[PDB]
RNA sequence: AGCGUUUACUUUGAAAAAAUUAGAGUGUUCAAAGCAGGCCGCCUGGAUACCGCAGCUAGGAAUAAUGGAAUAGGACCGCGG
């Protein structure tokens, strides 16, 4: 079940069997490296890179075209932003839930929402301080917290 | 059921039923014993034989002892494999 | 969530032998999971076993027979000295007859009489009889 | 039915299941070769795209977004790619 | 010779044979560009059942996808020179030992028996690839596995079953059967 | 004689006061006890087990923790030093 809600959704993807890449696919290694090169400078999160790879380009998964992962293609090539993005897409919600709720004071319900979302931010970053991918004296406080885009 | 001796020494061995293999109490009245007949293969005659099956009363209420008899007479040869 | 395998894997055959299924699908296959079911086979309460294979956790399809009557895990994992045997399968198993406790020593996954053989305690995994 | 062939499910049976609960999971989705009426250079499309995929030059635009499948605009022939 | 052997030992006058029939094709064949620094292991050859063998061919691990580019044409050529011996090519990886409490870095899982198994069996049957596999653990407690190919290339592959079972087994000791499943593709 | 990712687990060995308890021998006339006794000077016992947990020691490596290369400041091999 969902962390902080009550639903049991079953909804995410399902690999096939065969990891083998398909005949027609004539894009190699070096060429979805230079492809995902160019996403990510343009301004593109891991995420955005895979699906415009697969949607248009036709590139089932970019672990058996490569045999990176996009992030460890990006980090090795050193275009991987600094703080992740999942923590960086929490900290941009509860931003924007915070600018709505300074205005709007009698939202209990995104008072409620804040403090959820908040829960998750910090539960995420404590992951990252131990796995060092954060420094140990990095803080979410939602004083400065905007300084963060 | 023999002691060190190897004397067959309880009073008797209740039937096990022919699909779930659980064995059939003394008490146990909603259990069957059905006798199928044997057919001679050119005359299409009754032999004299028969492939008997034994089926549990929980099997039967469950509604399971018609699909279970059909495999038994599948696998005995009775009905036919294309069925 | 799914903190022990075993546990799930063992109710769900005891449900299906119950329920009076032929054979049964255990969903995440484990080294202690097929080590558990061949000690059980090596005595012949379940039939053979095939573990599909996918690349992820397996799939365990087991042919029942029916003469098992129960199946179950002991969690947690004690730690049974070889002087505690007794005083465990004395009040887990049904009889002096019949019935295993299979426990993981350092030899491998084996039930009390094979324990007992090579002079080994362990750990209780669970028990079929 | 007690009997059931967990191991052989016959294929209308496992391509009915949900993508997941099948035996070994497999993606209801694919690939398609997707041409426009005027040019000759065909796109690779996914079934369930998500985005807009514009034929190369933004000569048009082939797919759109929705629910579930991509919608493929009128007067579009496609061939599912396989393997 | 085109046969570097890891060891700094002497090439048997067979595998010698097999690396320079590699020499006479590379010299003759439209393949002269693409076996030039493609370079040969070692050449074995096992006794199958019923009164067949086969010559089973070792490739250096980066090699492989180069050799794999022309493996089928090169098969062919190969097979039309040994009268009635199969031919399979399978790249070499070291399997390295599980550290045990007696006695160095973290052994890369790539070097590890159950890795290098499922690579060896990926690589025996190139051209039909595997789609499925299941391991039937027998009354007795001994295990045979069931590798479902790619029903594409069943009659290109289906007359080499009985010899990439025999030569599996001289390999690694695991018994196999191959199916073509007839569900999916 | 030395060296060899740590830890729990398990089996072995050591070290563990007697008395009590369990327990072998022995007609306190039997028994509770007692450590005596037995044979025509001699012959004999006064055993053995049990004693958690922590500490010590030697085997085993299933199970459950924990460590190694990812800014390569990586292992090995050699040459300037």
Redesign the pocket.
Known sequence: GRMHAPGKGLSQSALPYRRSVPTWLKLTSDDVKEQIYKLAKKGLTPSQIGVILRDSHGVAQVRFVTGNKILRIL??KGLAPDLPEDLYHLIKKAVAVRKHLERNRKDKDAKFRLILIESRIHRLARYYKTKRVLPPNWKYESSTASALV | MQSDAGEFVDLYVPRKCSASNRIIGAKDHASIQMNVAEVDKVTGRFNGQFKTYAICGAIRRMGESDDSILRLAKSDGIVSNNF | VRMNVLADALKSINNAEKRGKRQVLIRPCS??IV?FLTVMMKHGYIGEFEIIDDHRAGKIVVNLTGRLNKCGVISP?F?V???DLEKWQNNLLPSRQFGFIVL??????MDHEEARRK?????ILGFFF | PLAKDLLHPSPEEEKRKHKKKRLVQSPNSYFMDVKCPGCYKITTVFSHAQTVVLCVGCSTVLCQPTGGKARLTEGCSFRRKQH | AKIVKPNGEKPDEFESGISQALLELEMNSDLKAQLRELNITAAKEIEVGGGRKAIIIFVPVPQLKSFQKIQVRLVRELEKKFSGKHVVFIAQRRILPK???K??????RSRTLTAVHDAILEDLVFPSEIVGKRIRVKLDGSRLIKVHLDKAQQNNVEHKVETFSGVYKKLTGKDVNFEFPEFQL
Not at chain 3, 104 to 109: E, L, N, Q, R
Not at chain 5, 103 to 108: D, G, L, V, Y
């Open positions: 980090k090795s | 080294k202690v080590r994992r730690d000295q070889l002087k993981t020593t350092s030899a491998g996954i002079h080994t305690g362990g750990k | 550290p045990t409490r006695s160095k870095q973290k052994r890369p």
